[PDB]
Amino acid sequence: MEPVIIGALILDVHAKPSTTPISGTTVPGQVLFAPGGVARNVADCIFKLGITPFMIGTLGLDGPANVLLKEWKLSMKGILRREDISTPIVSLVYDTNGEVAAGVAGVDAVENFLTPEWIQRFEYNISSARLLMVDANLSSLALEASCKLAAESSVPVWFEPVSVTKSQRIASIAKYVTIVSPNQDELIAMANALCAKNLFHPFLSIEDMFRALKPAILVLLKNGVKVVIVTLGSNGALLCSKGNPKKALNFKRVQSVCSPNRFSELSPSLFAMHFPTIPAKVKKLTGAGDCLVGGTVASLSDGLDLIQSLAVGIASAKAAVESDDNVPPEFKLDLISGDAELVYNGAKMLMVHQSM
Amino acid sequence: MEPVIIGALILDVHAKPSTTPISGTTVPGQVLFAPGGVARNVADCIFKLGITPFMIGTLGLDGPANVLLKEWKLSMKGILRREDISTPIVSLVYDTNGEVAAGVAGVDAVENFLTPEWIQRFEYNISSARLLMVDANLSSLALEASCKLAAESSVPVWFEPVSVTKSQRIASIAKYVTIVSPNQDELIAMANALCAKNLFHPFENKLSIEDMFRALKPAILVLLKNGVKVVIVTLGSNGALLCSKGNPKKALNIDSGEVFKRVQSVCSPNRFSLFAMHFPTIPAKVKKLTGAGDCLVGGTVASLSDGLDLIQSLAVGIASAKAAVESDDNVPPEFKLDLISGDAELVYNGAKMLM
Ligand SMILES: Nc1ncnc2c1ncn2[C@@H]1O[C@H](COP(=O)(O)OP(=O)(O)OP(=O)(O)O)[C@@H](O)[C@H]1O
Ligand SMILES: Nc1ncnc2c1ncn2[C@@H]1O[C@H](COP(=O)(O)OP(=O)(O)OP(=O)(O)O)[C@@H](O)[C@H]1O
Ligand SMILES: [Mg+2]
Ligand SMILES: [Mg+2]
Ligand SMILES: [Mg+2]
Ligand SMILES: [Mg+2]
Ligand code: NA
Ligand code: NA
Numbered sequence: 001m002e003p004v005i006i007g008a009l010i011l012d013v014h015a016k017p018s019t020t021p022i023s024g025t026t027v028p029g030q031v032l033f034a035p036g037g038v039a040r041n042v043a044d045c046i047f048k049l050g051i052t053p054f055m056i057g058t059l060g061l062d063g064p065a066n067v068l069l070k071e072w073k074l075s076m077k078g079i080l081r082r083e084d085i086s087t088p089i090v091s092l093v094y095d096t097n098g099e100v101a102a103g104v105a106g107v108d109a110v111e112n113f114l115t116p117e118w119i120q121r122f123e124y125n126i127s128s129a130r131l132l133m134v135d136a137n138l139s140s141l142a143l144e145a146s147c148k149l150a151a152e153s154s155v156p157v158w159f160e161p162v163s164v165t166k167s168q169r170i171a172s173i174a175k176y177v178t179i180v181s182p183n184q185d186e187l188i189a190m191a192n193a194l195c196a197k198n199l200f201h202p203f204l205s206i207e208d209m210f211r212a213l214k215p216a217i218l219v220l221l222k223n224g225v226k227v228v229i230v231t232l233g234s235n236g237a238l239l240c241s242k243g244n245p246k247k248a249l250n251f252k253r254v255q256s257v258c259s260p261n262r263f264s265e266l267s268p269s270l271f272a273m274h275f276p277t278i279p280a281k282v283k284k285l286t287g288a289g290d291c292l293v294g295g296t297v298a299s300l301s302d303g304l305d306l307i308q309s310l311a312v313g314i315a316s317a318k319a320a321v322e323s324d325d326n327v328p329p330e331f332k333l334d335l336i337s338g339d340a341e342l343v344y345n346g347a348k349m350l351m352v353h354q355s356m
Numbered sequence: 357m358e359p360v361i362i363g364a365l366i367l368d369v370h371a372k373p374s375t376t377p378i379s380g381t382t383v384p385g386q387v388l389f390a391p392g393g394v395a396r397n398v399a400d401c402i403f404k405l406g407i408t409p410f411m412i413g414t415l416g417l418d419g420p421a422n423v424l425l426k427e428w429k430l431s432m433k434g435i436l437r438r439e440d441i442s443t444p445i446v447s448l449v450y451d452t453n454g455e456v457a458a459g460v461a462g463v464d465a466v467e468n469f470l471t472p473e474w475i476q477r478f479e480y481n482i483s484s485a486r487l488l489m490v491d492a493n494l495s496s497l498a499l500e501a502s503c504k505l506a507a508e509s510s511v512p513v514w515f516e517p518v519s520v521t522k523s524q525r526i527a528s529i530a531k532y533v534t535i536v537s538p539n540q541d542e543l544i545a546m547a548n549a550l551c552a553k554n555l556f557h558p559f560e561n562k563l564s565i566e567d568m569f570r571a572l573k574p575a576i577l578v579l580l581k582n583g584v585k586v587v588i589v590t591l592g593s594n595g596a597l598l599c600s601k602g603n604p605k606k607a608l609n610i611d612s613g614e615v616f617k618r619v620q621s622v623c624s625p626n627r628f629s630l631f632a633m634h635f636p637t638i639p640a641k642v643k644k645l646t647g648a649g650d651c652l653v654g655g656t657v658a659s660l661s662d663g664l665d666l667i668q669s670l671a672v673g674i675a676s677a678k679a680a681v682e683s684d685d686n687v688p689p690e691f692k693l694d695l696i697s698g699d700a701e702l703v704y705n706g707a708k709m710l711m
Binding site: 011013015016017021022023024025026027028029030031032033062063064066067070089090091092093099100101102103104105106107108163164165185 | 369371372373377378379380381382383384385386387389418419420422423426442445446447448449455456457458459460461462464
């Protein structure tokens, strides 16, 4: 009952300059191709963790597609290929700290050609999935078709918001969505989408960040999202759920060491925990959030609970920021396990002194 | 006796935003791949004009190489490929006015892996070449090795200056070079490199052709007195200056396609020691200036390779450059030879003596 992953397959061009980029000219640096796209990365990540996902997406019959498919070891049955399709390309120029200085995304093939008509061919895979992961590169209509199919079979849906603009596609599907994984800005954009107004604004301690984000988080939850995971970069992640997180969504290494009886307080309408990350040496930050999703989905797919699974996701994200690839060539399970335990044992409840 | 082309194979990545580029994330837009590198472009251009060149360069066994070689239909014999080589890429992200907002060039493989040793494997091809074209992405040692092999077999050498910085690599090979094709900026840089002092200064409005020539003449003279025989100064929409030691109607000493016959029937060889000529260009609707200087070289080299004289040949090069600026690619997917011929005629007939 494999997890089904639906969304963008993208050829990333990553330009890491040796010094500070300057308008009007080129600086020397390192320019690389990396297999990318949120859905492709998530599927890649899940597979490298020992779980087989089913990928649904679209590619051209062009050079970038060949690069993307060169080492592809999963089924391609879900991949729409047509000659009138241009394989999506993202070009990033980084700053010397590893943050994106300037970027252009050309991903219109996903919005235009990854259609309900293509996706509905796979109603069996979706309705029988352990979980459905959709990214926001899909058009609203594709998103609706996907999420309704999962929903009618009570298959939990993970919505990956992709960007501040695309995250707003939550608006027409929130009731069908079980889990979302925005960063701070995407969370605010999503809240504003669901409010149909620009009521919350973008942007220090964890309690402070949480107090700032809480109203926005509540907006998503009462619009039907059951779990909000707010990724905070080097500050880790927040896990907020409607109801107890263990029965809200509703490996052998991790399960033995990240005890499902560590946390006493495990049903409130807003449950909130902070997960720290682990000090890393960054080669490239791109693809960390995607590996957080991959690692979490893989663990959930193997029967771990959401607190354990997120710990694994955060371990996987750490491994990713230390690679030039979006997803590391390989994961080492002793490292992932070790890191997951650290994150997990370091995780804390928020709203401890509050009671509302 | 194929013309031999040595230098960069580069994947150009052009990122065109739809709106405002933002820190930390992507703006939507269009990203285009264009096969690039001065030498690869020249070889591409020559081939599309009906002449087969021999290309010497270096590529990785990676993704960018796959994209680059997807439509390459020429021999790969001269291309050094290894698994530890990262294929050159220049990545440009534009702003909405059309200027480079941020750009990164990763092209060090040319200098590090296109060595004199690799080049000497093709001494036979070079010594028998009708013409040798080198670009300045080559290391100085690679440049010296190439040009010495050509000189010893009296093969004409065309040096493409590539950029203001790399143009200065002319200094250790000037005596070996027959033809150079700098723009204004590259010309000054090259003259400064060759002089015992930096007497020339950079670039202020545009200005008339006779005046531009007068301003540039001293820098041009520095190149000639250092052994360069022909200086082609490219001037963008103002065409090109052609300055030579001895009269400009020079042909390759070779004992022929349909570029030759179209053009010669139409660009009459009886229309026409420092000689200077101005060649006008032809109004185009620019979609991208990409590839213009390279197709000028490509077109001229192709015409010389088919037996045309330098004057006829430069006229074709200017026609070819015009076609390049009307393409998104560095080199148009195709040339239409009657059109190239028609444009070359205008240029040829519009060209005038300055000195
Ligand atoms: N510098 C870092 N050190 C350790 N872990 C990190 C670091 N940066 C990110 N991570 C891990 O990656 C996760 C997601 O990071 P972030 O919130 O920056 O991703 P994003 O904003 O979705 O963008 P992307 O996924 O492209 O990185 C974080 O929750 C964290 O666990
Ligand atoms: N707008 C145009 N219309 C017609 N011909 C053009 C135009 N722009 C350039 N050309 C032709 O291209 C030739 C080269 O132009 P330019 O001198 O700008 O090249 P460059 O400075 O070497 O830049 P690049 O290497 O990017 O081509 C010119 O001599 C001209 O004949
Ligand atoms: Mg993300
Ligand atoms: Mg995220
Ligand atoms: Mg030039
Ligand atoms: Mg040039
Ligand atoms: Na990475
Ligand atoms: Na062009």
